[PDB]
Design a protein around this motif. Sequence first.
Motif, PDB file in Angstrom:
ATOM      1  N   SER A 273       0.815  -1.220   0.000  1.00  0.00           N
ATOM      2  CA  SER A 273       0.000   0.000   0.000  1.00  0.00           C
ATOM      3  C   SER A 273       0.849   1.271   0.000  1.00  0.00           C
ATOM      4  O   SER A 273       0.409   2.322  -0.453  1.00  0.00           O
ATOM      5  N   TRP A 274       2.082   1.171   0.469  1.00  0.00           N
ATOM      6  CA  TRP A 274       3.011   2.305   0.484  1.00  0.00           C
ATOM      7  C   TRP A 274       3.984   2.276  -0.700  1.00  0.00           C
ATOM      8  O   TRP A 274       4.877   3.125  -0.809  1.00  0.00           O
ATOM      9  N   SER A 275       3.812   1.292  -1.575  1.00  0.00           N
ATOM     10  CA  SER A 275       4.639   1.161  -2.756  1.00  0.00           C
ATOM     11  C   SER A 275       3.896   1.710  -3.973  1.00  0.00           C
ATOM     12  O   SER A 275       2.664   1.671  -4.038  1.00  0.00           O
ATOM     13  N   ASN A 276       4.665   2.191  -4.940  1.00  0.00           N
ATOM     14  CA  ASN A 276       4.119   2.735  -6.168  1.00  0.00           C
ATOM     15  C   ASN A 276       4.347   1.667  -7.214  1.00  0.00           C
ATOM     16  O   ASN A 276       5.460   1.501  -7.707  1.00  0.00           O
ATOM     17  N   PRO A 277       3.298   0.929  -7.568  1.00  0.00           N
ATOM     18  CA  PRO A 277       3.464  -0.178  -8.500  1.00  0.00           C
ATOM     19  C   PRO A 277       3.953   0.273  -9.891  1.00  0.00           C
ATOM     20  O   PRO A 277       4.478  -0.545 -10.657  1.00  0.00           O
TER      21      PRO A 277
END
Length: 641
Positions: A273-277
């Motif tokens: 959720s804190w990663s930018n896919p």
Amino acid sequence: LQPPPQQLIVQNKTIDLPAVYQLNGGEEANPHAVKVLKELLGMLISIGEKGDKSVRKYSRQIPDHKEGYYLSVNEKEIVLAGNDERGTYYALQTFAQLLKDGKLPEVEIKDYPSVRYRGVVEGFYGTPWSHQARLSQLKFYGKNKMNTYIYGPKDDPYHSAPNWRLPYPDKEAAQLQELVAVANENEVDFVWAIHPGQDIKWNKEDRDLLLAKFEKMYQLGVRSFAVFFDDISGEGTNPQKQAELLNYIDEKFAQVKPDINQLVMCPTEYNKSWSNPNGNYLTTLGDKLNPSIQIMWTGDRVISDITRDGISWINERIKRPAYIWWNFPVSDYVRDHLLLGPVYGNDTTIAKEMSGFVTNPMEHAESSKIAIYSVASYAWNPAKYDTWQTWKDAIRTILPSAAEELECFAMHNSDLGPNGHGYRREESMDIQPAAERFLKAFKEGKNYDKADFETLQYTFERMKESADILLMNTENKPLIVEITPWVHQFKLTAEMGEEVLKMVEGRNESYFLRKYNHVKALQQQMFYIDQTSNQNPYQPGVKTATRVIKPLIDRTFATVVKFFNQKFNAHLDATTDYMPHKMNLPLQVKANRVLISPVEIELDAIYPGENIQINFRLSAGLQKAPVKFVRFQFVLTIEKK
Ligand SMILES: [Ca+2]
């Protein structure tokens, strides 16, 4: 046995610990294992690591796995044979659990961990664990075959910014030196973490300062290192620069010293959720970070359980098995709760997809041993992980003298309440159906089942017993010190439930009024505890039995007062939480703030005003002006303070 071994054959025979014994391998075996054995205790006892003379006969029984061991007990001999020195120590930790009242079961065990690194990350916000608490933890980890302790308390100034650059002062440095020595005695890798990211400059000065700090820690005995880039903003979030720093540490320090073990990093994007896919952060780390460097991960959210699909997602991007940082039982975002329930929710079939599994615990160190013990069990043998048995085993281990009382208390202190991380746990599941029925019936004027009323009654009674006994328990004083405020609150909860049930039975008007007044007084008593205990800046106070019991009590109280008011044409106040100030939303008091749960407020006295925040970015200093009334988030702050 905890953790349960990979393979166990029991013979339904017992023997006696040999009063006279011959010890084979004592001089050549792991000295840490041999010390345990000699403490515990002719019949031959063979101790050693694969390759030692003492265990040549058993070389094919010894699992070919790091930290693996063969253990055998029979009529003729005892075998304690490690694949490596840590395996031998672990055989002894299993051996110690088999020994009951001078007797041993006849058994053969072949055992090894399914996850390579297993342990605790002291990685939370709040008061860092005391030195004595840490000493106690390290012993606990060895007993439960946890091989890793990562030191990284967010509020240690020499761990985080700006004093990460500074060597520890002498007192703390000596303490750290002792912790490393104790860690090593217990077969635990002390991993010293640094959290430089918030103010690091990507220049030589800071790189050198970092390496210089690591050198200082190495001089104190530290042989495993971590760099944490979590919960930071700014230029320190740059993945190329992060990977270059880590690779430099690896190449100039970790691969240069004679005896460094783990090198680990916690990414800035540390959960899905804190990663930018669509960003390059994680793939950059995965491609650029040297393959021996571990990368940590908390799952799909900051607080989450670890799933096959979740770990697949990260592993694909970092190109290596994630080293799990599991954010339970950490309570640093629900500081008014104790999280004493079972460990569950993590996939039991994904050992191969993780390099490691560590738990981030509560700032309450002893309390956290329930979860720690259960994580140790899970990480060692996930295939055989039994949630509820392990929780009971943990409690009986932690507080043998009052295990049933601690179970009572923990089973009603498991949930987190509503929170910004969206994470919840089951609580009070046993009585939840009886509660739910009783209240459904009672509210609608249908007759409730007597057995349900009796179950509620029994529970409240058991809660009081548990509270009084735990308060007075001297087997683990530090645990009791940690939980005491919650125990007081839990007792008041149970007393309140008992009186509310007497109101439901409602013999006559006079009796009802007596119980009603008693309940109001108990409400006030709970308020005082909530205002005097655990007064931290973020979630002050003490909550307990929040998921099922407190709601049942409160709603039942409000209901029976409503019925009384109808039947006797009365005007009893049906409010369920005490509030000394007056204002349909309930007011709240948190520290020196008086707060409307998101027109006119009247305080119970005149105070110097500090300020109002309101928010529908409204703020106004009151310059210490006396204030009792306030007319118009909506937060008055007063000098109290
Ligand atoms: Ca040896």
